[PDB]
Amino acid sequence: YPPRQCGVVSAKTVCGPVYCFTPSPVVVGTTDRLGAPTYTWGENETDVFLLNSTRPPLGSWFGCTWMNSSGYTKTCGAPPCTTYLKCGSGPWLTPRCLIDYPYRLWHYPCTVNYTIFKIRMYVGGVEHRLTAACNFTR
Amino acid sequence: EVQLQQSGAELVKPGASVKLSCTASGFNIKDTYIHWVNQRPEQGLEWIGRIDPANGHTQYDPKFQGKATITADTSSNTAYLQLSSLTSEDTAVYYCATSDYSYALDSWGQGTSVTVSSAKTTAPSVYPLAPVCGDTTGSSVTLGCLVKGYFPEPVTLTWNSGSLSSGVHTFPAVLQSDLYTLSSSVTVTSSTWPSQSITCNVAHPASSTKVDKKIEPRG
Amino acid sequence: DIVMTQSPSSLAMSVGQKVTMSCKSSQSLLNSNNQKNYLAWYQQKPGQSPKLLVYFASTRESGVPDRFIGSGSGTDFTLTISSVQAEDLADYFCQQHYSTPYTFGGGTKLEIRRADAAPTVSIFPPSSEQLTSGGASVVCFLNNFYPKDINVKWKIDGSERQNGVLNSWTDQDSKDSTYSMSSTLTLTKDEYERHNSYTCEATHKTSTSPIVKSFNRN
Ligand SMILES: *[C@@H]1O[C@H](CO)[C@@H](O[C@@H]2O[C@H](CO)[C@@H](O)[C@H](O)[C@H]2NC(C)=O)[C@H](O)[C@H]1NC(C)=O
C-alpha cells in the first residue's frame, strides 16, 4: 500500500531519481518558485517536485517512488478504492506484480527473485509497453 | 499500435550480405520482443526470428540459422537483421514487428525492400504530364507523372509531399527491358490547378529524389 | 513445423454481406493453463504492411471494428466479417503464435463487389523534357471503373498499333471499390513526330461504344 497521496517533495529530502508511474516509468524533474506560486516556499528551498496527480486517465501518474535523504524508500500514490486503471497507486499492478524500471531493485529490494515478462496496456488511447516482475512469498 | 521505422530499400549482389535496421519511437524497445518476417513478391509471410533486447536472447527458424543474425541496441532503440550469402530467392520485403509475452505481432514496420541482383542501380527519369494543349475547361482536371527507367524496386511517389492524397492513383511498376516504369495520376477541381502549384515527388531508395517536377500547363 | 492451411484462396463480397474464412492447424494450439488458443489473424491491405486483427483466436485487438469476429478452437478456426466494408479489401493471414517457428497460412484474398462504373479517360502527350532526350511516351489513364476487365486500343493516324504498349492495373480502390488502369505507348521522338493524330480507345461493358480520347500534335 502507499502511505499517502502524492504531494510536494522539496528536492533535498530526495536522494536519487524520482520515478513516477504512468504505466510507463518516468523520471520527474524539479520546479522552482516560478513553477509553484502557491507552494509555501521557504528560503532554504530552491527546487521541489510537484507530484500531485489523479489517475492517468485524467491525471499524470498512478504513483511515485523515491528514496529519502536518509536512504529510506518512500512511495506515494492515488487513494485506494481495467485491473490497474481504477485502483493503481504506484508501480504495483497487483499485490504480486510491479512495473520494472532501472531503480526497482534499489527501491524494492524484496523483489529480487520476481519473474519478469513483457506486457502491453492501453491507457487513454496511448499504448504502454512495460516489463512486469511477479510471484509469491511464503 | 507503436511506431517502428525501417531503413530504406537496398540492392545486394548475389552472395553478399545486407543489414537492415528497425528503430522504435514512442516506447522503449527493451519492453518488447522484436521479430523479423519476410514476404516474397506476391507471396505469404514467413517468420525469420526474434530477439529479446533486454538481454539479447534470440530464437530463429532453423533454416535461417547462420544466414540470419538479429541484434539489438537499446542505446539507440534499434533492432537489426543481418542476412549473409544472399540469393535471388532472398529478394523480398522484410518487416520488423513487436510482441509482448504472447508473441502475437501487434505492430509492424513499413518493411524494407531487398533486391538481390548482379545488375546495378539506375535512377529514373521523372516526367510531368500536363493536360493536352488547348483542352476544354471542365469542373476537374487530371495531371500525370511518369517515372521511367529505374532499378530496382521501389519508388515512392507523392503529390505536394503528403498533402494531396485523395484523387491520386499510382499504378504498379511494369518491367520492360531490365528497367521498371510506373505512372501516377491525380485529379483535382479546375479551380485548384493551375492557380496553386501541384508537384510530383519521386524518391528512389538508391538515394535519389526528384521533387523538381512541378506540373506546368503546356504551350 | 505447424502447418496452417487457409480456405478459400479468394472471396468476392459486396458491401454489407457477411463472410467467413477458415484456418486449420496441423496441431492443437491450446494452452490448458490458459484455456487460450494461440492463433492470430492479420490483415494486409494493398500496398500496406500487416496489422494484427485478432489474437488468442477470439480476442479483438483494441481499435479493430466490432464486425471482425475470431472463433474456433483445437485445430479449427474462423474469421468472420459480419458486415463486409469497402475498407476491408485485403489479404488475411492466420498464424499460430504457439511454438517456434511461428508459421502463417497462405492467406485468403478479400475483394469487393460493386455496381458497374464507367472509366474516366485522360490522354497525355509526351512531355517536353522526354522529347528533349529522344523518347516520346503517350499515356492514357482510365480511372475509377468496374468491373476490372477493359480493353485499350492505340490508334496512330487512325491505324491500330500494337508494339510499344504497356498496361498496368491498380489494386481495387479502398473507398469506392473501383479499378484504374494506365496504358503507355512509347516511341522514338522521330517516330512520334512523323505522325499527327494519337488516339486511345477504351472498350468496357459499361457502354456498347468505345470511349475515345484523342489529340493532334497540330
Ligand atoms: C499538492 O499536495 C500537497 C500535499 O502535500 C498540498 O499541500 C497541502 O494542501 C492542503 C490543502 O490546501 C493544506 O491544508 C496543507 O497545509 C498543505 N501541505 C501539506 C504538507 O499537507 C497542495 O495543496 C497540493 N497542491 C495542489 C495544486 O493540489
Numbering used by the authors:
A (entry chain E): 491 to 571, 596 to 652
B (entry chain H): 1 to 219
C (entry chain L): 1 to 218
Sentences reproduced from the published study:
The X-ray crystal structure of the E2core+stem, lacking the HVR1, AS412, front layer, and TM regions, in the presence of a non-neutralizing antibody, 2A12, was determined. Crystals of the E2core+stem (456–713) fragment bound to 2A12 Fab were determined to ~2.5 Å resolution. The final model consists of residues 491–571 and 596–653 of E2core+stem as well as heavy chain residues 1–219 and light chain residues 1–218 of 2A12 Fab. The E2core+stem structure had no interpretable density for most of the stem region (residues 653–713). In the structure, the stem region is disordered while the CD81-binding loop is in a bent conformation, sequestering the Tyr529 and Trp531 residues within the center of the loop. The CD81-binding loop (red) is packed against a symmetry mate, holding the loop in the bent conformation. Removing the CD81-binding loop from the superposition calculation lowered the RMSD to less than 0.3 Å for similar carbon alpha atoms; therefore, the presence of the front layer, HVR1, and stem has no effect on the globular fold of the E2 core region. The CD81-binding loop in the E2core+stem structure is bent towards the back layer of E2. The distance between CD81-binding loop residues, Tyr529 or Trp531, in E2core+stem (bent) and eE2, containing the front layer, in the absence of CD81-LEL (retracted) are ~17 Å and ~19 Å, respectively. Comparing the extended CD81-binding loop of ΔHVR1 eE2, from the complex with tCD81-LEL, with the bent E2core + stem demonstrated a ~30 Å and ~22 Å distance movement of Tyr529 and Trp531, respectively. However, the E2core+stem was incapable of membrane binding, suggesting that the CD81-binding loop alone is insufficient for membrane binding and requires the front layer for proper orientation.
Hepatitis C virus (HCV) uses a hybrid entry mechanism. E2 is a type I membrane protein with an amino (N) -terminal, soluble glycoprotein and a carboxy (C) -terminal, transmembrane helix (TM). The CD81-binding loop presents two invariant hydrophobic residues (Tyr529 and Trp531) at the tip of the loop, which are critical for interaction with the host membrane. Cluster of differentiation 81 (CD81), scavenger receptor class B type I (SR-BI), claudin-1 (CLDN), and occludin (OCLN)8 are cellular factors necessary for HCV entry.
